[PDB]
Amino acid sequence: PAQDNSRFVIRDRNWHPKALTPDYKTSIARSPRQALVSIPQSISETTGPNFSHLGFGAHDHDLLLNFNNGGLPIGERIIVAGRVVDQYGKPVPNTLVEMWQANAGGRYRHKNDRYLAPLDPNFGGVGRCLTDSDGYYSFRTIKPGPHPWRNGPNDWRPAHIYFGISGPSIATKLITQLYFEGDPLIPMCPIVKSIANPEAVQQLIAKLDMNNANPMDCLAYRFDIVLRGQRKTHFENC
Amino acid sequence: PAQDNSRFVIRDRNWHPKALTPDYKTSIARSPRQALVSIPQSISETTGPNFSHLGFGAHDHDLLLNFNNGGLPIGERIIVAGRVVDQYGKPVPNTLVEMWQANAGGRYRHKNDRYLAPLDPNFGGVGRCLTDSDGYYSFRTIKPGPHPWRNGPNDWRPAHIYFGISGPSIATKLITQLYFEGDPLIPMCPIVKSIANPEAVQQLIAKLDMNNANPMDCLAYRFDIVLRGQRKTHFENC
Amino acid sequence: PAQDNSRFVIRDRNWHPKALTPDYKTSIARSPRQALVSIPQSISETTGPNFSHLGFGAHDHDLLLNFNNGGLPIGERIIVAGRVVDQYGKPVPNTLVEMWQANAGGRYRHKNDRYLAPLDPNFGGVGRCLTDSDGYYSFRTIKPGPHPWRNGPNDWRPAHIYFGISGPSIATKLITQLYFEGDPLIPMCPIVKSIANPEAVQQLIAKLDMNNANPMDCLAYRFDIVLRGQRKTHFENC
Amino acid sequence: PIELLPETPSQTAGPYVHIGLALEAAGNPTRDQEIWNRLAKPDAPGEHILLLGQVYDGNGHLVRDSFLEVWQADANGEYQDAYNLENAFNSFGRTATTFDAGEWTLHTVKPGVVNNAAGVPMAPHINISLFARGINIHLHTRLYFDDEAQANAKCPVLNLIEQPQRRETLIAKRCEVDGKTAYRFDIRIQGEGETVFFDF
Amino acid sequence: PIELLPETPSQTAGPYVHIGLALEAAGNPTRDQEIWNRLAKPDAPGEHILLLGQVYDGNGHLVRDSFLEVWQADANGEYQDAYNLENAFNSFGRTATTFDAGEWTLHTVKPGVVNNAAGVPMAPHINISLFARGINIHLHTRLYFDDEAQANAKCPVLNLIEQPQRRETLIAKRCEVDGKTAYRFDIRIQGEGETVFFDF
Amino acid sequence: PIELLPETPSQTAGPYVHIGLALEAAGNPTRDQEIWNRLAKPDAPGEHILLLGQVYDGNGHLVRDSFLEVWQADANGEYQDAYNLENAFNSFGRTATTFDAGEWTLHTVKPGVVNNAAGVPMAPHINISLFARGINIHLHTRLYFDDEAQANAKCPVLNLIEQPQRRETLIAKRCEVDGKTAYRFDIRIQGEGETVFFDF
Amino acid sequence: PIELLPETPSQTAGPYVHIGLALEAAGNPTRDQEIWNRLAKPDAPGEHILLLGQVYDGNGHLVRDSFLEVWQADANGEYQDAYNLENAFNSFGRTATTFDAGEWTLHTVKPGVVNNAAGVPMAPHINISLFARGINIHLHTRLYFDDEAQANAKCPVLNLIEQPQRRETLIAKRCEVDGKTAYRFDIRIQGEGETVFFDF
Ligand SMILES: [Cl-]
Ligand SMILES: [Cl-]
Ligand SMILES: [Fe+3]
Ligand SMILES: [Fe+3]
Ligand SMILES: [Fe+3]
Ligand SMILES: [Fe+3]
């Protein structure tokens, strides 16, 4: 069974978005008004699931083939790849990385999405993989389109892909959104701007990666993820 | 019939791309090696077709509906709109504007395109319209995807739409390509870079135009076109 | 009757003052805490009254003569004039402009103002007019004085004139305050500072306009007003 | 991206808004023609109604200096923009709360049905803009009618309010006042029962 | 001071989180192996329990698109990190609220006691992380059990909550659902009875 | 000096120009009205002629994806700018080389004489603009006729070409195709026999 | 975009490249082991062949100081990277043009067929890199064989050369030299019959 044998650097909750960010309207009623209660790390917080033995299908990481209904999906073929490290720069191997997104037209395959842009019969919108022994992951997909939404009267999400990363403990688990280099919608989005610090926003912008592209086939974007630094305990209980 | 009653400001052929731009490989054998022969403007050069009485179909300017084979095309719904003016800032009314492009995945509906990205059964790729009495045009389309091509070993066109504009004479007629704000492929493209002056390249980049978007429906880009200045003749033959 | 054939550019509610601006104390209890609900524009929002046939008195625009009780009001004689345009730069003709203000000493002719500075028997404090066919309006008045108020223990409004402008629809209607170039009270005022962006504040500062003054008679200030941009509908319901 | 001229920013109408827009209420003489709270002369077609209401702040206290502008269709569901005091009906009006009781009134006809831009019928409504001391930019709302429950249930604007409980804040309550049909529409700017406000 | 690489910042999981993490809920086909809400096969040692709950916003309205991850010790107070659908018990699971009723469920066993880092026993608890549209960074909480009153009273984590009244927000209510032992754990994100959320 | 707005810079029409400007050639359905290669209906006044040609690159290889626009006077030496598919004659047309043979064709009448701006007669000519993959800005040229030797000798435009040998590159060769009068006009973009291109 | 470390830039190998890479040719003593122009010992399986050629500049003059590196599959179509002078066959070799006649020679076996990355068979070829004074970055080409005409016609690499006439520049001509099969492969760096050069 799991053991308590490490501590995780405390989060900077002014680097992360705060809970109450009123331009993102749904955050108003879904943000706590009392302060979070700080607690010390115990084995409850410093352990977490390892997914080495979850069974992945052959195409779980490949959205061009994992919703095949007779052809290829329409849209910009891309590889999304990167490395998961902690804040000390250590790789995070064999960790679970999940991702989901709308199709090329900004339409999500979800019963609750009523946007008028059509579904693509060969695009599902979900991928998953484990990072390799050196902390690297890779997906193949279609670049998602921007999505309008009922926040302000003319609000549009930039193209984005959701990411979920487990890391070594429940203390490191994160969901975030990847955006794409140069997208003029990024500075305008009240969900991007839930993050107060512009340098933190830059950390979510995937860079065009020509070196990883397949000529005559697919482009590539690079998105590196940094999870909380993990260190050994020292001088504890003495 | 047409009359000679105007002169057109001489082109700056260091502003336009030069003929020989060897990084764009096909230009090497398809560029003249002799200098162009300058000739004075006559009625042959200073007149041109007026297309007021060309018959346009209902959807000629609307690529979401002009290749309808049972559904909407997949991809980012956009309006592309702008004004055609001359270099004196005068509007160019009732002028022919034609445009064509690849689909959302960078695939062209042309027998000679064998890029492996699929065709979209509801996307054709061509539009046309006339500018209105104040020089404005608009199209509705899908944002085209980048396209790989056999130039260098890993070359990719930025997303682009071809434009053809007639203007008042054969001397003003132009074909160009529109690119999209922020596209990280733009600085890398040997066809963009056929234009030596980076300020000239900026003139081809369409800007995101939130003011012209239809909420919950389609985004919009603005692309203004400037044709050669037209002036009256003065002090000629005296 | 009125028709729905226009759309109005969405308001930037970070350019406008937010509802909750606690240094302006009365805003604390009179600001909503739930998000505004965005709705699409319909004929209910894109139409509004036209006052071309409201009957104006001869002196409605002239506060030096419209409360005449035996003499002229005391204070700095000024013309206040400017143009009403929309965000596209289009003039807004035949639109209703209303203004009201305190007298030279900062006393309002209102039963609820108990400030110790005296009323002026020949000054009322209200003007109205329509813009002309080119979007221009003009009033003649006295420059109002600063007004103390029970906000903080030593708070004083800068000299200011209230304006209300109808525009082409209820979506464009606006009430604002005009301030005067160079007034050292402006940067200290919590009502001014309800506007977060300093460039937005500058848009409310009327400029000394010597070109419009009547020598040996009255000075002039210029205050241009920009209403939401109005465009035709396009590609709707298709 | 394309940047237009910025809109002139809003400011509060202030406690003395009446000097400019409600002359009698300020204590002052009126001009020959004023824009006020009678949208319909007795001869206007439709059902003649009284509207009245009070405005509350976040502490449950009356906002006694509120100023309201209203915009509504005529009984045929058509908006009449040509404002004229000679008209039997005008689509536009103004009212203000009394400083003692905090109550505003309007005299009008019940509006007819209007479609949204997509052709779907909206339930009968009066568009309201609320101005006052402490309000930096006016608040937009709609007054709907409790005798239109079936229409209200299908209104595509009310249906954009995610929680059904909040839709109730926009429904005016029918009563009788001096033998004429009346509706009360109270506005709660903040807190429990906060009235829905719109952006458009 | 020493600055490390900054952590990748959180963003909301959004209303369509189910596409990625709750495939059936989105309306989509599932893959061969999914991480879901059954932590215990029928043969797992310990007391088998149903957990259920609803999530409320600051206006007391259901959060119907909530997504929850849970982490708990097995019945012997041991964390089982080798996730495998062949196991009789997994310490990790996922669940989501139904869109109609707003209710989530979990099928597990009651966790055994685990000591904190100082060796002091904590009361039986399930660690919960809550994700949703409108939640920019997930909220951490713990579910404790109302039939562990003596242990709860002594828990060094509960005792870090300064006001005893707030501790009550983390105590799930024992009931019976279809003759099976169950506990209800409702979460109130905001306002009256706001659930305690942790930082660690 | 005085600087006007800069002209929008040209770019290549690319290999798929036919999608926009030569629909049938791309392999695609045509619209009701298309601007194409038949400038004259059978009832047009003047001498009816077939024009044909091939386009060569600097290595003497066919340019198979060339696109051509033409502008010419009618048989009376008048430019007809009111384009209409109902007209007996239009001064404007478009053509493209076949992908297999590399040959373009045009069906028109021989143009009448037009004077330059100084009133000096120009020899009969068709104005041609050439677009293709590899061509960054279109090339302007003129097609003159070999049976107009006397006029060609006196043309004030031909006479601006400094070397007589280069003038020969603009003279089309009269022939017969299926008993019909034709002229061949080949273009050599680069190298030996390079076609004169104009700037104006 | 992502930027890696930049590659060290190329420079000309210069006229005295032989000092480093062709010691005998410079006029100097050789070391015990040298990498040179005999890829095959008599015992190597396959068809033993002589290759020879001359290199021409843009004026038709011999490039007498050219230096060539070659890389080819063995007779089975397998690349042998473990370079060893004890081997019966090495896939790699070097040669240089004589300063008097301008001719290089290589002694090897005919390579077997190799598939491209897509599984399509390439015609038999030797990969060549050419270095010399005046060549700033080496030029890549391929030597194919004129006794493989049917295979050459289907080669997916030769098929990337747009003009069939340019493909002929890569086909070596079979002859007999002192009773042994030989092929001549002349390279024209520039101008008429310019050899195709590759980038990859
Ligand atoms: Cl939405
Ligand atoms: Cl290509
Ligand atoms: Fe004031
Ligand atoms: Fe999203
Ligand atoms: Fe292209
Ligand atoms: Fe040297």
Side-chain angles (χ1 to χ4, degrees), chain D residues 32-53:
Chain D
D32 290 340
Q33 299 201 0
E34 297 290 342
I35 303 162
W36 200 234
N37 74 339
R38 297 194 165 260
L39 279 70
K41 305 191 158 164
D43 261 39
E47 179 77 24
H48 290 245
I49 58 171
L50 172 72
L51 306 168
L52 60 97

mmCIF file of all heavy atoms in Angstrom, chain D residues 32-53:
data_model
loop_
_atom_site.group_PDB
_atom_site.id
_atom_site.type_symbol
_atom_site.label_atom_id
_atom_site.label_comp_id
_atom_site.label_asym_id
_atom_site.label_seq_id
_atom_site.Cartn_x
_atom_site.Cartn_y
_atom_site.Cartn_z
ATOM 1 N N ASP D 32 -43.462 73.652 -21.195
ATOM 2 C CA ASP D 32 -44.711 73.394 -21.924
ATOM 3 C C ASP D 32 -44.891 71.921 -22.266
ATOM 4 O O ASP D 32 -46.002 71.374 -22.126
ATOM 5 C CB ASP D 32 -44.779 74.224 -23.208
ATOM 6 C CG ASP D 32 -44.973 75.698 -22.942
ATOM 7 O OD1 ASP D 32 -45.426 76.056 -21.833
ATOM 8 O OD2 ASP D 32 -44.679 76.500 -23.856
ATOM 9 N N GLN D 33 -43.815 71.278 -22.732
ATOM 10 C CA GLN D 33 -43.854 69.835 -23.036
ATOM 11 C C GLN D 33 -42.824 69.070 -22.208
ATOM 12 O O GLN D 33 -41.652 69.427 -22.194
ATOM 13 C CB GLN D 33 -43.617 69.571 -24.527
ATOM 14 C CG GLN D 33 -44.663 70.209 -25.444
ATOM 15 C CD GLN D 33 -44.742 69.550 -26.822
ATOM 16 O OE1 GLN D 33 -44.014 68.598 -27.139
ATOM 17 N NE2 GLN D 33 -45.632 70.066 -27.654
ATOM 18 N N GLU D 34 -43.276 68.009 -21.541
ATOM 19 C CA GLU D 34 -42.398 67.141 -20.748
ATOM 20 C C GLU D 34 -42.674 65.691 -21.096
ATOM 21 O O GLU D 34 -43.816 65.311 -21.363
ATOM 22 C CB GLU D 34 -42.693 67.310 -19.250
ATOM 23 C CG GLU D 34 -42.428 68.709 -18.689
ATOM 24 C CD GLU D 34 -40.949 69.045 -18.615
ATOM 25 O OE1 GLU D 34 -40.098 68.121 -18.668
ATOM 26 O OE2 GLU D 34 -40.643 70.249 -18.510
ATOM 27 N N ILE D 35 -41.623 64.879 -21.046
ATOM 28 C CA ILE D 35 -41.718 63.434 -21.270
ATOM 29 C C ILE D 35 -41.973 62.803 -19.911
ATOM 30 O O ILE D 35 -41.117 62.872 -19.013
ATOM 31 C CB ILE D 35 -40.408 62.875 -21.852
ATOM 32 C CG1 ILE D 35 -40.046 63.585 -23.163
ATOM 33 C CG2 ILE D 35 -40.491 61.328 -22.023
ATOM 34 C CD1 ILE D 35 -38.563 63.409 -23.557
ATOM 35 N N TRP D 36 -43.147 62.174 -19.746
ATOM 36 C CA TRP D 36 -43.495 61.702 -18.409
ATOM 37 C C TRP D 36 -44.238 60.356 -18.402
ATOM 38 O O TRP D 36 -43.967 59.521 -19.258
ATOM 39 C CB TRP D 36 -44.138 62.833 -17.556
ATOM 40 C CG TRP D 36 -44.093 62.585 -16.045
ATOM 41 C CD1 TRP D 36 -45.173 62.594 -15.174
ATOM 42 C CD2 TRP D 36 -42.940 62.248 -15.236
ATOM 43 N NE1 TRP D 36 -44.751 62.299 -13.903
ATOM 44 C CE2 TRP D 36 -43.399 62.067 -13.911
ATOM 45 C CE3 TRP D 36 -41.567 62.077 -15.508
ATOM 46 C CZ2 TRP D 36 -42.527 61.748 -12.848
ATOM 47 C CZ3 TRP D 36 -40.705 61.754 -14.455
ATOM 48 C CH2 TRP D 36 -41.192 61.596 -13.147
ATOM 49 N N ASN D 37 -45.109 60.129 -17.419
ATOM 50 C CA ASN D 37 -45.530 58.755 -17.063
ATOM 51 C C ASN D 37 -46.901 58.329 -17.621
ATOM 52 O O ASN D 37 -47.424 57.306 -17.220
ATOM 53 C CB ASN D 37 -45.502 58.585 -15.528
ATOM 54 C CG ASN D 37 -46.669 59.295 -14.835
ATOM 55 O OD1 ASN D 37 -47.272 60.198 -15.400
ATOM 56 N ND2 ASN D 37 -46.983 58.885 -13.618
ATOM 57 N N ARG D 38 -47.470 59.124 -18.532
ATOM 58 C CA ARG D 38 -48.734 58.760 -19.190
ATOM 59 C C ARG D 38 -48.469 58.428 -20.648
ATOM 60 O O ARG D 38 -48.307 59.327 -21.470
ATOM 61 C CB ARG D 38 -49.775 59.882 -19.057
ATOM 62 C CG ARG D 38 -50.153 60.129 -17.613
ATOM 63 C CD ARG D 38 -51.416 60.975 -17.425
ATOM 64 N NE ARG D 38 -51.880 60.839 -16.044
ATOM 65 C CZ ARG D 38 -52.879 60.040 -15.669
ATOM 66 N NH1 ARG D 38 -53.557 59.333 -16.574
ATOM 67 N NH2 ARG D 38 -53.218 59.974 -14.393
ATOM 68 N N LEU D 39 -48.373 57.136 -20.946
ATOM 69 C CA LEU D 39 -48.053 56.657 -22.301
ATOM 70 C C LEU D 39 -49.306 56.606 -23.158
ATOM 71 O O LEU D 39 -49.220 56.605 -24.386
ATOM 72 C CB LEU D 39 -47.423 55.261 -22.253
ATOM 73 C CG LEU D 39 -45.916 55.242 -21.916
ATOM 74 C CD1 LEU D 39 -45.623 55.635 -20.478
ATOM 75 C CD2 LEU D 39 -45.337 53.874 -22.226
ATOM 76 N N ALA D 40 -50.473 56.583 -22.509
ATOM 77 C CA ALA D 40 -51.718 56.409 -23.269
ATOM 78 C C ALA D 40 -52.760 57.441 -22.876
ATOM 79 O O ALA D 40 -52.988 57.649 -21.693
ATOM 80 C CB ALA D 40 -52.262 54.987 -23.055
ATOM 81 N N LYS D 41 -53.360 58.099 -23.864
ATOM 82 C CA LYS D 41 -54.578 58.899 -23.635
ATOM 83 C C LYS D 41 -55.790 57.956 -23.601
ATOM 84 O O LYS D 41 -55.734 56.862 -24.183
ATOM 85 C CB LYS D 41 -54.777 59.924 -24.737
ATOM 86 C CG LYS D 41 -53.589 60.837 -24.958
ATOM 87 C CD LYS D 41 -53.912 62.004 -25.879
ATOM 88 C CE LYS D 41 -52.908 63.145 -25.636
ATOM 89 N NZ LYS D 41 -52.913 64.150 -26.726
ATOM 90 N N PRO D 42 -56.895 58.381 -22.943
ATOM 91 C CA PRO D 42 -58.063 57.489 -22.807
ATOM 92 C C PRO D 42 -58.522 56.821 -24.106
ATOM 93 O O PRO D 42 -59.082 55.725 -24.050
ATOM 94 C CB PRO D 42 -59.148 58.425 -22.250
ATOM 95 C CG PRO D 42 -58.363 59.404 -21.413
ATOM 96 C CD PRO D 42 -57.078 59.642 -22.191
ATOM 97 N N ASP D 43 -58.221 57.455 -25.242
ATOM 98 C CA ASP D 43 -58.615 56.997 -26.586
ATOM 99 C C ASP D 43 -57.695 55.960 -27.228
ATOM 100 O O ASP D 43 -57.956 55.485 -28.347
ATOM 101 C CB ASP D 43 -58.675 58.189 -27.542
ATOM 102 C CG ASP D 43 -60.076 58.700 -27.753
ATOM 103 O OD1 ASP D 43 -60.854 58.741 -26.777
ATOM 104 O OD2 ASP D 43 -60.387 59.065 -28.903
ATOM 105 N N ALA D 44 -56.598 55.616 -26.565
ATOM 106 C CA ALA D 44 -55.688 54.640 -27.152
ATOM 107 C C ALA D 44 -56.376 53.266 -27.125
ATOM 108 O O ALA D 44 -57.044 52.943 -26.149
ATOM 109 C CB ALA D 44 -54.386 54.597 -26.368
ATOM 110 N N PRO D 45 -56.233 52.475 -28.205
ATOM 111 C CA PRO D 45 -56.741 51.096 -28.215
ATOM 112 C C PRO D 45 -55.959 50.185 -27.254
ATOM 113 O O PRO D 45 -54.781 50.447 -26.943
ATOM 114 C CB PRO D 45 -56.516 50.653 -29.670
ATOM 115 C CG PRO D 45 -55.424 51.545 -30.165
ATOM 116 C CD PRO D 45 -55.678 52.858 -29.521
ATOM 117 N N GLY D 46 -56.628 49.140 -26.772
ATOM 118 C CA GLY D 46 -56.021 48.209 -25.819
ATOM 119 C C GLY D 46 -56.575 48.295 -24.409
ATOM 120 O O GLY D 46 -57.486 49.084 -24.123
ATOM 121 N N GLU D 47 -56.014 47.463 -23.538
ATOM 122 C CA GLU D 47 -56.413 47.398 -22.144
ATOM 123 C C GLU D 47 -55.615 48.409 -21.340
ATOM 124 O O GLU D 47 -54.398 48.260 -21.157
ATOM 125 C CB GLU D 47 -56.216 45.979 -21.591
ATOM 126 C CG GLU D 47 -56.594 45.813 -20.122
ATOM 127 C CD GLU D 47 -58.094 45.728 -19.896
ATOM 128 O OE1 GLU D 47 -58.830 45.340 -20.830
ATOM 129 O OE2 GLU D 47 -58.536 46.055 -18.774
ATOM 130 N N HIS D 48 -56.303 49.440 -20.871
ATOM 131 C CA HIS D 48 -55.685 50.483 -20.048
ATOM 132 C C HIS D 48 -55.330 49.954 -18.659
ATOM 133 O O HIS D 48 -56.153 49.317 -17.987
ATOM 134 C CB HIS D 48 -56.584 51.718 -19.984
ATOM 135 C CG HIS D 48 -56.647 52.457 -21.278
ATOM 136 N ND1 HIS D 48 -56.168 53.737 -21.425
ATOM 137 C CD2 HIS D 48 -57.088 52.074 -22.499
ATOM 138 C CE1 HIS D 48 -56.328 54.119 -22.680
ATOM 139 N NE2 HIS D 48 -56.871 53.121 -23.354
ATOM 140 N N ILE D 49 -54.084 50.182 -18.245
ATOM 141 C CA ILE D 49 -53.566 49.655 -16.985
ATOM 142 C C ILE D 49 -52.739 50.699 -16.231
ATOM 143 O O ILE D 49 -52.157 51.605 -16.843
ATOM 144 C CB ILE D 49 -52.705 48.368 -17.217
ATOM 145 C CG1 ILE D 49 -51.522 48.662 -18.178
ATOM 146 C CG2 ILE D 49 -53.609 47.228 -17.780
ATOM 147 C CD1 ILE D 49 -50.492 47.515 -18.303
ATOM 148 N N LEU D 50 -52.728 50.555 -14.906
ATOM 149 C CA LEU D 50 -51.850 51.275 -14.012
ATOM 150 C C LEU D 50 -50.702 50.336 -13.663
ATOM 151 O O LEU D 50 -50.938 49.162 -13.381
ATOM 152 C CB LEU D 50 -52.613 51.665 -12.736
ATOM 153 C CG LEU D 50 -51.769 52.271 -11.616
ATOM 154 C CD1 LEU D 50 -51.315 53.715 -12.010
ATOM 155 C CD2 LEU D 50 -52.524 52.237 -10.295
ATOM 156 N N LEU D 51 -49.462 50.840 -13.727
ATOM 157 C CA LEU D 51 -48.291 50.128 -13.162
ATOM 158 C C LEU D 51 -47.756 50.911 -11.991
ATOM 159 O O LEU D 51 -47.773 52.146 -12.007
ATOM 160 C CB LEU D 51 -47.182 49.945 -14.216
ATOM 161 C CG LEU D 51 -47.650 49.269 -15.507
ATOM 162 C CD1 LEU D 51 -46.568 49.401 -16.561
ATOM 163 C CD2 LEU D 51 -48.015 47.816 -15.282
ATOM 164 N N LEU D 52 -47.302 50.205 -10.961
ATOM 165 C CA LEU D 52 -46.715 50.866 -9.816
ATOM 166 C C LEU D 52 -45.678 49.978 -9.184
ATOM 167 O O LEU D 52 -45.700 48.764 -9.358
ATOM 168 C CB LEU D 52 -47.789 51.228 -8.767
ATOM 169 C CG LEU D 52 -48.586 50.081 -8.171
ATOM 170 C CD1 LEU D 52 -47.980 49.671 -6.851
ATOM 171 C CD2 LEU D 52 -50.022 50.523 -7.955
ATOM 172 N N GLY D 53 -44.773 50.582 -8.428
ATOM 173 C CA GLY D 53 -43.749 49.775 -7.800
ATOM 174 C C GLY D 53 -42.893 50.552 -6.840
ATOM 175 O O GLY D 53 -42.927 51.771 -6.812
#
